[PDB]
Each structure stands twice: as C-alpha cells, then as structure tokens.
Design a protein around this ligand. Sequence first.
Ligand SMILES: *P(=O)(O)OC[C@H]1O[C@@H](n2cnc3c(N)ncnc32)[C@H](O)[C@@H]1O
Length: 642
Amino acid sequence: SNDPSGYNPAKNNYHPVEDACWKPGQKVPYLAVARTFEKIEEVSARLRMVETLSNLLRSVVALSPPDLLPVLYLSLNHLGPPQQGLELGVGDGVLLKAVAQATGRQLESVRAEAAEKGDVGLVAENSRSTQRLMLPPPPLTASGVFSKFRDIARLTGSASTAKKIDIIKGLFVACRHSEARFIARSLSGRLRLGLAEQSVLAALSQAVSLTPPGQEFPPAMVDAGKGKTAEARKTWLEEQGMILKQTFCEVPDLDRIIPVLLEHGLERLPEHCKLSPGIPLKPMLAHPTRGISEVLKRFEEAAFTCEYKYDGQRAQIHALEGGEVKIFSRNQRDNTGKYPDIISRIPKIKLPSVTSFILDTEAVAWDREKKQIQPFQVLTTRKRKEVDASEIQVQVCLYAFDLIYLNGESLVREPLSRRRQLLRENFVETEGEFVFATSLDTKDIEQIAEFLEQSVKDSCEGLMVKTLDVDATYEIAKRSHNWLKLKKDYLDGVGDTLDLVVIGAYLGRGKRAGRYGGFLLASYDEDSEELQAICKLGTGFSDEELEEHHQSLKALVLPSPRPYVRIDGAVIPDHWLDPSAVWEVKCADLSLSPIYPAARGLVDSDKGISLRFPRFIRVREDKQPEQATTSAQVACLYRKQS
DNA sequence: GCTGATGCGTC
DNA sequence: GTCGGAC
DNA sequence: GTCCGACGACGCATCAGC
Ligand SMILES: *P(=O)(O)OC[C@H]1O[C@@H](n2cnc3c(N)ncnc32)[C@H](O)[C@@H]1O
C-alpha cells in the first residue's frame, strides 16, 4: 500500500495484503524489514517476535514470493548456505571507516561514539551522509540490500577493502529512517534482535501454513487458521513447525528448501529434501550438567553410556556412494581441503561392505612419536584450506562416537544403542589414527565419578553422557541438546580458580550498553612487583552483580595507567582502574598466550599464560592485589596440566 | 616480498 | 566456549 | 529446558601498508 515508514507488522489482526506497505509484485522495501526488526527489538517475549516476523513473511509470500529468500537471510544475518563459505570481510574496523567517510566525520569521533553508545547502528543512523544530493536515491529494497551484501563478500584481492567501503557508503547514502541502524548492525555481525535461527524457522512454518504459497492473486486463503479453534490451530502449527524443523536440521540450506516450499508446499517438503552424504547436517549438541546427581535426575531410569569428551574439533565425515569424501565442521563449513590425511585413510577405517556413511567424530592432535594426545592449541596450528598431504606437520587422530547414515539408511530416528553397534561393527580401529571413543555403560555413581577422574588423567575434558534407548535418537528438531556434558570445572569447589586483580574495564555493547561489558585482569609478578595482564573477563556475573561492579569501580578510574601495570599487546581498556579489586575467576585450562604478559619467561621465553573459558565466580573482599595469585603460581598451574 | 592489523572461525 | 535473563 | 546474546583465548588467511 502506502508509506513504509508507518508499517506495523506487530498489528493485531494483521492482514497480509491490506496491512503490507507495498503493492503486489513490487519488491519488498528494506524499510519494511527494518520496521519489523524495530518491532521485534522492542519486546522481550520470543513468541511475540515470532508472530511479528511471521506477519512480514506472510505478506512476502502473498505479494512478492521471490523476496522470501533474501528477507529470510537478512533476518538471520546470513549471506547464504554455510558450506559455501561466503564472508563479508567487514568488521568494526572497515565499518567504522565507512561510516566516518559517509558522514564526513573524523574516524576517532565515530569510534568513540560507537563505544559510548555500545552500538554502531546508532552512530550511522543519527549522522547524515555528506555524499547525499538534495534529492535522495531511490529507496532500498530487501533483495537489493541482500545482493549488495553478497557483492561485498565476493570482493577479494588487493585494494578490495576500498571497493567494499564504496558499496557500504552507497547503502548509507540511500538509507531512510531506521534503515542505517540495521545495515550497520548487519555489517558488524551484531544484528542482536533477540530472534535467531529457531524463531526464524518457527515464523517461516507459521507463515506458509497460514498463507499458503502458490495461490493465484489475490489469494483466496490469506489465513488458513481462521476456521480452527485456538487449540486445533496450535496443534496444527506445532506439527507443521516440526516438519520444517526436521527437514532443516537434515538439510540446513535455505537455497534448497525455499524454492521447494514455494512450489510444492511444506507437507511435501521431506520428499524433496532428505539427509544425504555430501550435504552437511546439524550436529547433536550437549547440555552442561553440573554434577553426577544432575545427570541421574535428567535421565531418571533410562540406561545411558558415559564417553570421554575429547579436546579437539568436531569433524562430520561424509562418504558418498561412488567414493567421494567430504568433511564438515560443527557449523556446516567445508573442511574437506583441510584434512587430506584423513581422506587418504578412509579406505583404512571402513570395511569393504560399507558403500556410504556419515560419521560423527572428534579430530584431536596426535603426537606419533610419543603416541599421545596433544592440546587443542596444537591442533589449531594446522593449515585451513588447500592443504597437500605431504605438508602436514600436526597429525590427527579421529575419535569416533556416532554414525548418522549407513549404506543408504538414515539413522536419525534410530536409538543410539543401534547406531553405536553399527559403528562398532562396520569400522576398523587403528591406534593413533581412528579409534572409538572410550566408553562405560553403568549407573553406579562411584564408577562414573572414577571414570570422570580417569578421562581427565587421559587428556580429556570430562564426560559426555547419552541415553541408549529412551529418547536416544539423532533428531535435532526434537531436542538439539540431547546429550549431557559433565566437566570437572563445572563442580563447585573443584577445578582451577585464581584470584586476579581488576586493572581495566571495557564499555559494554548491546545488552551491556550503558555500563561495563568486560574487564581486564592481572596476576601479580613477585619478582618485578608488577601486575601482569592475564586475560579479559565478561561472563559469570549476574546483571545485579555487574551493576555493583560498575558502582564499586567508578571511584578507581584513572586517566593514565599505573607504571607498575603491564599489559603489552592486550586490548587497551576504555577505562584504566587503580589496582584494588580482587576477583575469584575459574577457567578450564591455561594456555600459552602470544599477547598476555602474565608469567612470560617462566614456561616459555616469548609467551605468557592466559585462561581458557574464564568466568567470574565472586569478589574476594578479603584480598588486596599483593595477595592475588602470583605469576609463579600461574606457571605452576600450567605445568601440572602436563 | 614482508609484517601487522583485521576478520572469522574453532573451542 | 561459559554464563545469566526471559520465557 | 529452550532460545538468545552478552562476553572469553587463539590461530590461519587475507590485505593494507610498507
Ligand atoms: P561442547 O562443550 O558443547 O561439547 C560438544 C562437543 O564436544 C565434542 N566431543 C568430544 N568428544 C565427544 C563425544 N565422545 N561425544 C560427543 N561429542 C564429543 C564434539 O566436537 C561436540 O561438538
């Protein structure tokens, strides 16, 4: 209809035709998407966000079906299917430079304003573009903006950054109302709607259920739920939602799903898009569990297995009928070129009767000389793409723990008891190359506890716990976190805690805007009587605790750092703090840092020590900096990881 | 042709 | 990756 | 329990700057 600026997709009794802000066949205006983001961000109830997005999507289906795919990608802040590897190459650095040039302001003024407001979108929105003529360019369209994002991502090579900035400046010149806010957030990778993949899928299945695609215009059926009771409508939308969710979890690729959805409908979708080797799928995840008693409470009387939780990276290995092999990451990225050693070993791990499979494994760095597992840090030094087999320096051992597909059979609906038996019988172990995850089938608390201790002694993070027959399938759509993860450092009073000094604070972004979002911490070097930065910290405190931190550190702000505080290459804090507050901090491991100075020279000549997965536990009101954990104590903790 | 800063992915 | 907030 | 977005260390790949 008329004037996107007034578009209200949160409206009660939203009518997909009469309440749209564009006419049939027209391109969806980007302002329509921006206004939808505004109405989503204004509320906290996830179900209300879904309804609002569904309203937009229903208008897109009814009026401009070719724009459904770009509108969906804009709402997820994706560029396309993950296995295609498109990357903007734009962070806050490029973005802030483009905003400075677009608005004619100094880069430093823009950087300072972004940090104080905690959002680059607000800076871009509230400053005019000095490249704008008297008469604006035509309004942005959803598909136009999406295509420009893709243009940015495809620019490569020398002088490519300047070309990316030119595209961004062009977008800002054409923005109206709130559009610049969401372009900027999207480019920075921080859309921060409160609505993401699961809510987008729920909105999509609701939208195509209520307003079916493919109708002759004007659509005879704009609300297919209106003839049902509230109860019947809810059950129906839940069923339709699960059809979409389960297909997506097997084929998480909107380029494949959306054309089928528009042509054949949601009910026929599983017939056209099915799990198959060569198409990455969503992996099964794990829920953190803070004790053995919590495990037994979660699984009740269902038999379960405990497995070592190996410290590497996930590798989803696909063997296609015909011999081709592909390897994908946890997030559906193509890692095939990264593992020529693994690909060459596939004939060695599968019996000759296996014609196709999808394996779920952990790739762990392996020292062939000493025949033992190596830390994650070592694994991350492998090259990432177009790697040749002879050039591999860090060997990998695969620890296999699941089987999702075998000889043409999808196993997603099969219980782990059967998947595991098929894994054990059709694949071959080779020490230090391909091994089944160490496992224990028991319900005895004393055995589980001992097994947890042994997993740590054997260079693992803890245990994974999985039911064998009750709710034991690989249906991510039913429950994405169907497994449990049990780590020692989850236990209170157990694991490595340090008492560290707060030496700086960083202004918060997003949910943390208007206060501190992070802090710089330091250990005390006895030998030089200096405080050495050891890590940053940004999780572990409640919202109330964070407000107390803000009020207790405000009096410690210094304009300039103390000469006995050393941070070297760490990110300079927005506010320096007089060393006084001491906090108890927990971590999973200690790592060798190329940047932090803490304990430098005590374990390595060039590298200090930092914390893996640090989190705030509590303030140490009874400690001053002189009694904080020493750099020598940090080195001793690092060494005993062996 | 090299180095550092930036981006993005891994955990 | 950990964590807490909102539902 | 689910979903989400605050925030963590770290390393390769890339490209601006030299
Ligand atoms: P996150 O800490 O949420 O844990 C899940 C990941 O752990 C890895 N992993 C290692 N060993 C296993 C076993 N035995 N089973 C399942 N997952 C395991 C995977 O890479 C998961 O992504």
